[PDB]
Symmetry: D2
Subunit: 115 residues, 4 copies
């Protein structure tokens, strides 16, 4: 799997389950084209977004729908979403894990990139 | 100052100096319209972005140009930029500080909302 | 102020007010000896912990009493406290700010070392 | 596995490999007794520290030897180690993952606690 997303909840100390994730790829006309989407599992993970064939060199945006998640838990958070924007595969094919750790007024994101 | 931005460097243990910051507001036609911008100071801070008069309720995006910062340091980074997207909500006196802590393959952002 | 502590609350998007902070220095017999302490202010800050004269090179521990903070808010937390352990090193004018960002099941700490 | 540690490197965007981890348990005399230790794998993970039988209710400290890690990469970091102190199993047996994300002058730690 070349692109995986993992989301964790810093309030509950749990995976963040059923979080919507949308991936976009920047097109030649500078617009963000829909690329893939899904929801995190019971483990906070989202796999199977793309294939090595389709995940070509480009600029990608991973939008994680954090506000919808918090609101479903009774919390009015600060952010609309977390957005992770990066160039992928520009020094050859890599496997990318995009991890996010969520709180109501903060989040962090890291990437783990491997061969 | 209803809106301040503060950027810190987790590699050097320092303010992140001379980082470009762009603020956008969501318009009517769902377009991100430029709103304010600047470069962080020697203290990693950016003040004077807007006024209480202009900073009305709405959806805002703060783009922090992290990739160019790391390139200036000779360090290969992951993200193109950090994007912080939020709704400004009245209901009383509020000042917003958007803080970001930067590493090459990670960032963190929090909002400190006070009065 | 050669040593400041700043604590922020990632759930409320606010300074973490009235948090107990204890600082220790490593002695000769490898015992943590109390050095300084206080409670964070309304701005989440704790100043006046020590003087340039007393804050010599050595190994220091800053203990931030996070569990009691979350208990005061009625929120079940994971950690007993956050502990920040570091060597203070001269070689020129240096001021240390130990920042912490708190969530119930997570914390983050950075050092901003300036002159 | 009731206790797992995962460590990631925010500079390289990689697991933090070969990081020493020491676990202590607070004894009746208020002293920290050695409990378990190991080093992170190629995946940044450390499994097999303990068993459900031996991992009883108590206050535990997980010390992650971050300074040794950074120094081996040519970096002089701020912290001596990251310390994670928590009560375990005080509302019945749980599975704990202690995750840490490391930078030279910052780290974060979260816990994922499951049934
Ligand atoms: O990644 C995996 O693969 C993974 C998989 C499974 C499990 C775990 C996995 N890892 C993993 C682990 C973790 Cl801990 C993780 O979270 C990373 C959390 C990063 C913490 C956020 C850092 C907060 O920064 C700060 C801090 Cl300290 C202070 C401040 N304030 C100030 C500091 C100084 C001066 C002024 C201020 C201010 O405010 O005016 C602002 C910020 Cl912005 C992630 Cl995203 C993935």
């Amino acid at each position: 799997c070349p692109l995986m997303v993992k989301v964790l909840d810093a309030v509950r100390g749990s995976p963040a389950i059923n979080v919507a994730v949308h991936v976009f790829r920047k097109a030649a006309d500078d617009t963000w084209e829909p690329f893939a989407s899904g929801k995190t599992s019971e483990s906070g993970e989202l796999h199977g977004l793309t294939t090595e064939e389709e995940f070509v060199e480009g600029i990608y945006k991973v939008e994680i729908d954090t506000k919808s998640y918090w609101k479903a838990l009774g919390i009015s958070p600060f952010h609309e979403h977390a957005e992770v924007v990066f160039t992928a595969n520009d020094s050859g094919p890599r496997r990318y894990t995009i991890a996010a750790l969520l709180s109501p007024y903060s989040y962090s994101t890291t990437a783990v990139v491997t061969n």
